[PDB]
Design an enzyme around this catalytic site. Structure first.
Site, PDB file in Angstrom:
ATOM      1  N   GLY A 183      14.240  -5.132  21.879  1.00 49.35           N
ATOM      2  CA  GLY A 183      15.711  -5.372  21.618  1.00 49.35           C
ATOM      3  C   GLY A 183      16.126  -6.034  22.759  1.00 49.35           C
ATOM      4  N   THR A 184      17.466  -6.503  22.814  1.00 51.86           N
ATOM      5  CA  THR A 184      17.955  -7.333  23.740  1.00 51.86           C
ATOM      6  C   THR A 184      17.634  -6.867  25.238  1.00 51.86           C
ATOM      7  OG1 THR A 184      20.040  -6.102  23.513  1.00 51.86           O
ATOM      8  CG2 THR A 184      19.716  -8.133  22.324  1.00 51.86           C
ATOM      9  N   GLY A 234      14.445  -5.763  26.146  1.00 49.21           N
ATOM     10  CA  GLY A 234      13.114  -6.150  26.238  1.00 49.21           C
ATOM     11  C   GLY A 234      12.186  -5.420  25.272  1.00 49.21           C
ATOM     12  N   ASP A 292      25.517   5.601  23.651  1.00 44.78           N
ATOM     13  CA  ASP A 292      24.801   4.657  22.972  1.00 44.78           C
ATOM     14  C   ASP A 292      23.905   5.617  21.733  1.00 44.78           C
ATOM     15  OD1 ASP A 292      24.339   2.317  21.573  1.00 44.78           O
ATOM     16  OD2 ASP A 292      22.435   2.038  22.768  1.00 44.78           O
TER      17      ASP A 292
HETATM   18 CA   LIG Z   1      21.357   0.293  24.219  1.00 38.40          CA
END
Ligand SMILES: [Ca+2]
Length: 355
Positions: free
Chosen positions: A25-26, A28, A148
Protein backbone atom coordinates in the site's frame (compact mmCIF):
# COMPACT_ATOMS: atom_id res chain seq x y z
CA UNK A 1 12.54 -11.85 -1.88
CA UNK A 2 15.33 -13.86 -0.30
CA UNK A 3 17.23 -10.85 1.03
CA UNK A 4 17.38 -10.23 4.76
CA UNK A 5 16.25 -7.31 6.86
CA UNK A 6 17.89 -5.96 9.98
CA UNK A 7 21.49 -7.16 9.80
CA UNK A 8 22.96 -8.36 13.08
CA UNK A 9 26.22 -9.65 14.50
CA UNK A 10 25.18 -13.30 14.04
CA UNK A 11 23.24 -12.63 10.81
CA UNK A 12 25.00 -9.89 8.81
CA UNK A 13 22.79 -10.52 5.76
CA UNK A 14 19.77 -9.73 7.96
CA UNK A 15 18.04 -11.27 10.96
CA UNK A 16 14.73 -11.47 9.12
CA UNK A 17 14.95 -13.48 5.92
CA UNK A 18 12.32 -12.33 3.44
CA UNK A 19 10.19 -15.25 2.30
CA UNK A 20 7.06 -14.05 0.52
CA UNK A 21 4.90 -10.98 -0.08
CA UNK A 22 1.97 -10.36 2.21
CA UNK A 23 0.54 -7.00 1.18
CA UNK A 24 1.33 -3.52 -0.01
CA UNK A 25 0.00 0.00 0.00
CA UNK A 26 0.99 3.61 0.02
CA UNK A 27 2.70 2.86 3.35
CA UNK A 28 5.04 0.26 1.89
CA UNK A 29 5.21 -3.50 1.90
CA UNK A 30 4.58 -6.35 4.31
CA UNK A 31 6.65 -9.48 3.85
CA UNK A 32 6.51 -12.89 5.45
CA UNK A 33 9.90 -13.49 7.03
CA UNK A 34 11.86 -16.16 8.87
CA UNK A 35 13.31 -14.80 12.11
CA UNK A 36 16.73 -16.43 12.09
CA UNK A 37 17.13 -15.84 15.84
CA UNK A 38 13.95 -17.40 17.20
CA UNK A 39 13.34 -19.55 14.08
CA UNK A 40 9.75 -18.51 13.66
CA UNK A 41 7.69 -17.03 10.87
CA UNK A 42 6.97 -13.34 11.39
CA UNK A 43 5.56 -10.56 9.28
CA UNK A 44 7.64 -7.43 8.74
CA UNK A 45 6.11 -4.13 7.63
CA UNK A 46 8.75 -1.98 5.91
CA UNK A 47 7.63 1.58 5.38
CA UNK A 48 8.82 3.37 2.25
CA UNK A 49 11.53 5.85 3.26
CA UNK A 50 9.04 8.53 2.22
CA UNK A 51 8.68 10.73 5.32
CA UNK A 52 4.86 10.97 5.39
CA UNK A 53 4.40 7.23 5.78
CA UNK A 54 7.53 6.94 7.95
CA UNK A 55 6.42 9.35 10.67
CA UNK A 56 3.10 7.47 10.72
CA UNK A 57 5.06 4.26 11.25
CA UNK A 58 6.69 5.74 14.35
CA UNK A 59 3.41 6.64 16.04
CA UNK A 60 2.23 3.12 15.19
CA UNK A 61 5.20 1.67 17.08
CA UNK A 62 4.33 3.84 20.09
CA UNK A 63 0.70 2.73 20.22
CA UNK A 64 1.54 -0.93 19.64
CA UNK A 65 3.98 -0.85 22.55
CA UNK A 66 1.19 0.28 24.89
CA UNK A 67 -1.36 -2.19 23.48
CA UNK A 68 1.12 -5.03 23.80
CA UNK A 69 1.94 -4.09 27.40
CA UNK A 70 -1.73 -4.19 28.39
CA UNK A 71 -2.51 -7.30 26.29
CA UNK A 72 0.51 -9.53 25.54
CA UNK A 73 -1.48 -12.47 24.13
CA UNK A 74 -3.89 -10.33 22.05
CA UNK A 75 -6.91 -11.64 23.93
CA UNK A 76 -8.49 -8.40 22.69
CA UNK A 77 -7.52 -9.16 19.03
CA UNK A 78 -5.21 -6.26 18.22
CA UNK A 79 -2.15 -7.32 16.19
CA UNK A 80 0.91 -8.05 18.33
CA UNK A 81 4.09 -6.16 17.46
CA UNK A 82 7.03 -8.39 18.41
CA UNK A 83 9.85 -6.02 17.58
CA UNK A 84 10.86 -3.02 15.55
CA UNK A 85 14.06 -1.81 13.99
CA UNK A 86 15.44 0.55 11.38
CA UNK A 87 16.75 -1.13 8.25
CA UNK A 88 19.42 1.15 6.84
CA UNK A 89 19.41 0.07 3.19
CA UNK A 90 22.72 -0.37 1.36
CA UNK A 91 21.83 2.74 -0.64
CA UNK A 92 21.32 4.79 2.52
CA UNK A 93 17.55 4.73 2.79
CA UNK A 94 16.42 4.02 6.35
CA UNK A 95 13.11 2.16 6.40
CA UNK A 96 11.08 1.90 9.59
CA UNK A 97 10.31 -1.80 10.03
CA UNK A 98 7.72 -3.30 12.33
CA UNK A 99 7.85 -6.99 13.20
CA UNK A 100 4.51 -8.67 13.83
CA UNK A 101 3.26 -12.07 14.80
CA UNK A 102 2.54 -14.29 11.78
CA UNK A 103 -0.42 -12.79 10.00
CA UNK A 104 -3.12 -14.17 7.78
CA UNK A 105 -5.56 -13.21 5.05
CA UNK A 106 -7.56 -10.03 5.45
CA UNK A 107 -11.35 -9.88 5.35
CA UNK A 108 -10.80 -8.31 1.95
CA UNK A 109 -8.80 -11.33 0.79
CA UNK A 110 -11.59 -13.56 2.12
CA UNK A 111 -14.32 -11.65 0.27
CA UNK A 112 -12.21 -11.61 -2.87
CA UNK A 113 -11.41 -15.32 -2.68
CA UNK A 114 -15.16 -15.96 -2.47
CA UNK A 115 -15.75 -13.76 -5.56
CA UNK A 116 -17.28 -10.98 -3.36
CA UNK A 117 -20.12 -13.32 -2.34
CA UNK A 118 -21.76 -12.84 1.09
CA UNK A 119 -19.87 -14.12 4.13
CA UNK A 120 -22.04 -16.69 6.01
CA UNK A 121 -23.67 -15.17 9.11
CA UNK A 122 -22.06 -17.50 11.72
CA UNK A 123 -18.61 -16.36 10.54
CA UNK A 124 -19.76 -12.76 10.27
CA UNK A 125 -20.92 -13.05 13.88
CA UNK A 126 -17.59 -14.43 15.10
CA UNK A 127 -15.54 -11.81 13.24
CA UNK A 128 -17.84 -8.99 14.35
CA UNK A 129 -17.55 -10.07 17.98
CA UNK A 130 -13.75 -10.21 17.97
CA UNK A 131 -13.47 -6.91 16.12
CA UNK A 132 -15.78 -5.25 18.67
CA UNK A 133 -13.57 -6.66 21.43
CA UNK A 134 -10.62 -4.99 19.70
CA UNK A 135 -12.51 -1.71 19.32
CA UNK A 136 -13.62 -1.85 22.99
CA UNK A 137 -10.02 -2.34 24.05
CA UNK A 138 -8.92 0.63 21.93
CA UNK A 139 -11.71 3.06 22.81
CA UNK A 140 -12.43 2.14 26.41
CA UNK A 141 -9.21 0.62 27.71
CA UNK A 142 -6.81 2.93 25.80
CA UNK A 143 -8.89 5.94 24.64
CA UNK A 144 -7.56 5.41 21.11
CA UNK A 145 -9.53 5.84 17.91
CA UNK A 146 -8.39 3.66 15.01
CA UNK A 147 -9.94 5.75 12.17
CA UNK A 148 -9.16 3.15 9.47
CA UNK A 149 -11.46 0.22 10.15
CA UNK A 150 -12.04 -1.55 6.81
CA UNK A 151 -11.83 -5.11 5.42
CA UNK A 152 -8.12 -4.79 4.52
CA UNK A 153 -7.31 -4.08 8.19
CA UNK A 154 -9.15 -7.06 9.73
CA UNK A 155 -7.01 -10.20 9.49
CA UNK A 156 -7.77 -13.84 10.11
CA UNK A 157 -4.36 -14.90 11.38
CA UNK A 158 -5.46 -18.36 12.50
CA UNK A 159 -8.34 -20.33 11.12
CA UNK A 160 -9.70 -23.81 10.79
CA UNK A 161 -10.91 -24.65 7.29
CA UNK A 162 -13.75 -26.75 5.88
CA UNK A 163 -13.57 -27.84 2.25
CA UNK A 164 -12.92 -24.91 -2.18
CA UNK A 165 -11.75 -23.76 1.27
CA UNK A 166 -14.26 -22.43 3.81
CA UNK A 167 -13.38 -20.50 6.98
CA UNK A 168 -14.34 -21.85 10.42
CA UNK A 169 -13.39 -20.42 13.84
CA UNK A 170 -11.47 -17.32 12.70
CA UNK A 171 -9.03 -15.69 15.11
CA UNK A 172 -9.12 -11.97 14.23
CA UNK A 173 -6.42 -9.33 14.45
CA UNK A 174 -7.15 -5.68 13.88
CA UNK A 175 -4.11 -4.15 12.17
CA UNK A 176 -2.75 -0.82 10.90
CA UNK A 177 -2.40 1.60 13.78
CA UNK A 178 -0.52 4.15 11.65
CA UNK A 179 -3.54 6.49 11.64
CA UNK A 180 -4.72 5.88 15.19
CA UNK A 181 -5.14 8.82 17.53
CA UNK A 182 -5.12 9.11 21.31
CA UNK A 183 -8.23 10.95 22.44
CA UNK A 184 -7.83 10.84 26.24
CA UNK A 185 -7.19 14.60 26.34
CA UNK A 186 -8.35 16.06 23.04
CA UNK A 187 -11.93 14.92 22.57
CA UNK A 188 -12.70 15.97 18.99
CA UNK A 189 -10.69 16.35 15.80
CA UNK A 190 -11.44 17.65 12.34
CA UNK A 191 -8.76 16.29 10.00
CA UNK A 192 -10.05 14.19 7.13
CA UNK A 193 -9.50 10.58 8.26
CA UNK A 194 -10.72 7.09 7.21
CA UNK A 195 -10.76 5.71 3.71
CA UNK A 196 -13.62 7.14 1.66
CA UNK A 197 -15.93 4.13 1.73
CA UNK A 198 -15.81 3.74 5.52
CA UNK A 199 -15.71 7.46 6.37
CA UNK A 200 -18.35 8.67 8.88
CA UNK A 201 -20.46 11.69 7.91
CA UNK A 202 -19.24 13.94 10.73
CA UNK A 203 -15.74 13.75 9.20
CA UNK A 204 -17.09 15.05 5.88
CA UNK A 205 -19.28 17.64 7.59
CA UNK A 206 -16.66 19.07 9.91
CA UNK A 207 -18.70 18.81 13.11
CA UNK A 208 -15.90 16.98 14.96
CA UNK A 209 -15.07 13.27 15.00
CA UNK A 210 -14.14 11.06 17.92
CA UNK A 211 -14.43 7.37 18.87
CA UNK A 212 -17.82 7.14 17.19
CA UNK A 213 -16.38 7.36 13.69
CA UNK A 214 -14.98 3.83 14.19
CA UNK A 215 -18.47 2.50 14.92
CA UNK A 216 -19.72 3.94 11.63
CA UNK A 217 -16.86 2.23 9.78
CA UNK A 218 -17.64 -0.94 11.68
CA UNK A 219 -21.26 -0.81 10.61
CA UNK A 220 -20.37 -0.26 6.96
CA UNK A 221 -17.88 -3.12 7.21
CA UNK A 222 -20.49 -5.51 8.55
CA UNK A 223 -22.94 -4.66 5.77
CA UNK A 224 -20.19 -5.43 3.24
CA UNK A 225 -19.54 -8.77 4.93
CA UNK A 226 -23.28 -9.57 4.67
CA UNK A 227 -23.69 -8.55 1.03
CA UNK A 228 -20.18 -9.12 -0.30
CA UNK A 229 -20.19 -5.62 -1.75
CA UNK A 230 -18.75 -2.25 -0.68
CA UNK A 231 -21.71 -0.31 0.77
CA UNK A 232 -20.75 3.30 -0.17
CA UNK A 233 -19.20 3.35 -3.63
CA UNK A 234 -18.80 7.05 -4.29
CA UNK A 235 -15.74 9.26 -4.18
CA UNK A 236 -17.66 12.57 -4.10
CA UNK A 237 -18.77 14.13 -0.82
CA UNK A 238 -22.15 15.35 -2.08
CA UNK A 239 -23.15 12.00 -3.55
CA UNK A 240 -21.65 10.04 -0.63
CA UNK A 241 -23.81 11.97 1.84
CA UNK A 242 -26.88 11.37 -0.33
CA UNK A 243 -26.15 7.62 -0.38
CA UNK A 244 -26.12 7.80 3.43
CA UNK A 245 -29.43 9.65 3.40
CA UNK A 246 -30.95 7.06 1.02
CA UNK A 247 -29.75 4.03 3.01
CA UNK A 248 -31.15 5.50 6.25
CA UNK A 249 -34.22 7.36 4.97
CA UNK A 250 -36.62 4.90 6.67
CA UNK A 251 -34.75 5.12 9.99
CA UNK A 252 -36.41 7.56 12.36
CA UNK A 253 -34.42 10.75 12.79
CA UNK A 254 -31.73 10.00 10.16
CA UNK A 255 -31.18 13.26 8.25
CA UNK A 256 -27.99 14.85 6.90
CA UNK A 257 -27.86 18.28 8.55
CA UNK A 258 -25.16 20.91 7.80
CA UNK A 259 -22.56 22.12 10.29
CA UNK A 260 -23.02 25.47 12.03
CA UNK A 261 -21.56 28.18 9.89
CA UNK A 262 -18.21 29.43 11.25
CA UNK A 263 -17.46 33.01 12.06
CA UNK A 264 -15.99 34.47 8.84
CA UNK A 265 -13.01 35.45 10.97
CA UNK A 266 -12.34 31.88 12.15
CA UNK A 267 -9.15 30.32 10.77
CA UNK A 268 -9.28 26.93 12.50
CA UNK A 269 -8.98 23.62 10.68
CA UNK A 270 -12.50 22.81 11.81
CA UNK A 271 -13.98 26.08 10.54
CA UNK A 272 -12.18 25.55 7.21
CA UNK A 273 -13.74 22.10 6.92
CA UNK A 274 -17.23 23.37 7.84
CA UNK A 275 -17.03 26.11 5.20
CA UNK A 276 -16.18 23.50 2.56
CA UNK A 277 -18.94 21.22 3.75
CA UNK A 278 -21.47 24.06 3.64
CA UNK A 279 -20.92 24.30 -0.11
CA UNK A 280 -22.73 20.96 -0.28
CA UNK A 281 -25.90 22.55 1.09
CA UNK A 282 -28.44 25.05 -0.20
CA UNK A 283 -30.90 26.60 2.25
CA UNK A 284 -29.90 24.12 4.92
CA UNK A 285 -30.60 20.97 2.89
CA UNK A 286 -28.17 18.70 1.12
CA UNK A 287 -27.94 20.08 -2.41
CA UNK A 288 -28.45 16.81 -4.24
CA UNK A 289 -29.01 16.18 -7.13
CA UNK A 290 -28.90 19.82 -8.21
CA UNK A 291 -25.39 20.33 -6.81
CA UNK A 292 -23.84 17.57 -8.93
CA UNK A 293 -23.50 19.66 -12.07
CA UNK A 294 -25.28 23.04 -11.55
CA UNK A 295 -23.62 24.17 -14.81
CA UNK A 296 -25.93 22.25 -17.17
CA UNK A 297 -29.68 21.74 -16.76
CA UNK A 298 -29.35 18.51 -18.74
CA UNK A 299 -26.32 16.89 -17.07
CA UNK A 300 -24.64 13.55 -17.71
CA UNK A 301 -22.98 13.69 -14.30
CA UNK A 302 -26.28 14.46 -12.58
CA UNK A 303 -28.01 11.62 -14.43
CA UNK A 304 -25.34 9.08 -13.45
CA UNK A 305 -25.64 10.11 -9.79
CA UNK A 306 -29.44 9.84 -9.82
CA UNK A 307 -29.11 6.25 -11.08
CA UNK A 308 -26.41 5.39 -8.51
CA UNK A 309 -28.57 6.70 -5.66
CA UNK A 310 -31.61 4.89 -7.06
CA UNK A 311 -29.57 1.63 -6.98
CA UNK A 312 -28.59 2.20 -3.34
CA UNK A 313 -30.73 -0.02 -1.08
CA UNK A 314 -32.59 1.08 1.99
CA UNK A 315 -30.89 -0.50 5.00
CA UNK A 316 -33.86 -2.67 5.97
CA UNK A 317 -34.17 -4.19 2.51
CA UNK A 318 -30.62 -5.53 2.57
CA UNK A 319 -31.34 -8.15 5.19
CA UNK A 320 -33.25 -11.36 4.85
CA UNK A 321 -36.24 -11.60 7.21
CA UNK A 322 -34.42 -14.23 9.31
CA UNK A 323 -31.47 -11.86 9.88
CA UNK A 324 -33.45 -9.12 11.64
CA UNK A 325 -31.08 -9.43 14.62
CA UNK A 326 -28.09 -8.38 12.55
CA UNK A 327 -30.12 -5.48 11.11
CA UNK A 328 -30.88 -4.31 14.65
CA UNK A 329 -27.19 -4.41 15.52
CA UNK A 330 -26.22 -2.42 12.40
CA UNK A 331 -28.91 0.18 13.16
CA UNK A 332 -27.02 0.92 16.38
CA UNK A 333 -23.90 1.62 14.26
CA UNK A 334 -25.02 3.35 11.05
CA UNK A 335 -26.50 6.46 12.62
CA UNK A 336 -25.73 9.80 11.01
CA UNK A 337 -25.52 11.58 14.37
CA UNK A 338 -22.36 10.20 16.03
CA UNK A 339 -23.81 10.87 19.45
CA UNK A 340 -26.47 8.22 18.74
CA UNK A 341 -23.96 5.46 17.89
CA UNK A 342 -23.47 2.79 20.50
CA UNK A 343 -20.21 2.24 22.33
CA UNK A 344 -18.50 -1.01 21.36
CA UNK A 345 -18.91 -2.51 24.86
CA UNK A 346 -22.65 -1.91 24.48
CA UNK A 347 -22.71 -3.47 21.00
CA UNK A 348 -21.04 -6.52 22.52
CA UNK A 349 -24.10 -6.90 24.80
CA UNK A 350 -26.47 -6.92 21.82
CA UNK A 351 -28.61 -10.09 21.46
CA UNK A 352 -27.05 -10.77 18.04
CA UNK A 353 -24.07 -12.01 20.06
CA UNK A 354 -26.05 -14.08 22.55
CA UNK A 355 -27.78 -16.15 19.83
CA1 LIG B 1 -4.30 2.97 6.64
Amino acid sequence: VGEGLGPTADFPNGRYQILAPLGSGTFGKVVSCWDRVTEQLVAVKVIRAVRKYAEAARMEIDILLELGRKDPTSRFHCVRMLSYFTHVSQQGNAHVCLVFEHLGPSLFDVLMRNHFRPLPVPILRAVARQLLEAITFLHEHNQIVHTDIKPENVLIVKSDYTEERTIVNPDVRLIDFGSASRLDKVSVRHAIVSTRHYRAPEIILGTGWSFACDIWSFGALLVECYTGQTLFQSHDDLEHLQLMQKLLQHENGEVIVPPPRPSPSSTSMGSQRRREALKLFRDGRLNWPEGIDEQSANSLARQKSIRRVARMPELHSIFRPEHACLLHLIRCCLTIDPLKRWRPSELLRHPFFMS
